[PDB]
């Protein structure tokens, strides 16, 4: 009931959740680089 | 109503499945780190 400024907040919160997943995916792509470079020197 | 809450719910499933596949990636990085740590 008058869920207007409730749904329109869930949408924006679902956006920052998406951006936090995209930034952790970049971070995970930085970790795999480290393990494959530490392995190259073994 | 049932078109946005259908989409909002759909996004909760899309964000959930991306978390599960990201956890699969994390377990493999932990694997690689422990295989290299156990060698030093």
């Amino acid at each position: 009931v008058q869920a207007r400024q409730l749904l329109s907040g869930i949408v924006q919160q679902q956006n920052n959740l998406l951006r936090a997943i995209e930034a952790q995916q970049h971070l995970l792509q930085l970790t795999v680089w480290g393990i494959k470079q530490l392995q190259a020197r073994i | 109503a049932r078109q946005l809450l259908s989409g909002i719910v759909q996004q909760q499933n899309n964000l959930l499945r991306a978390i599960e596949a990201q956890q699969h990636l994390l377990q493999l990085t932990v694997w690689g780190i422990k295989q290299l740590q156990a060698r030093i």
């Binding site: 998406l18 | 759909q10 996004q11 991306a18 493999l28």
Partner: peptide
């Protein structure tokens, strides 16, 4: 778990996420 499988599961789980991000970006624009 194995190294030659590690490089296989890393690349396939990396693409699973990137498609799910593309799917989440499209669903976001609404």
């Amino acid at each position: 778990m194995t190294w030659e499988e590690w490089d296989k599961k890393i690349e396939e789980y990396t693409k699973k996420i990137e498609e799910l991000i593309k799917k989440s970006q499209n669903q976001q624009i609404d």
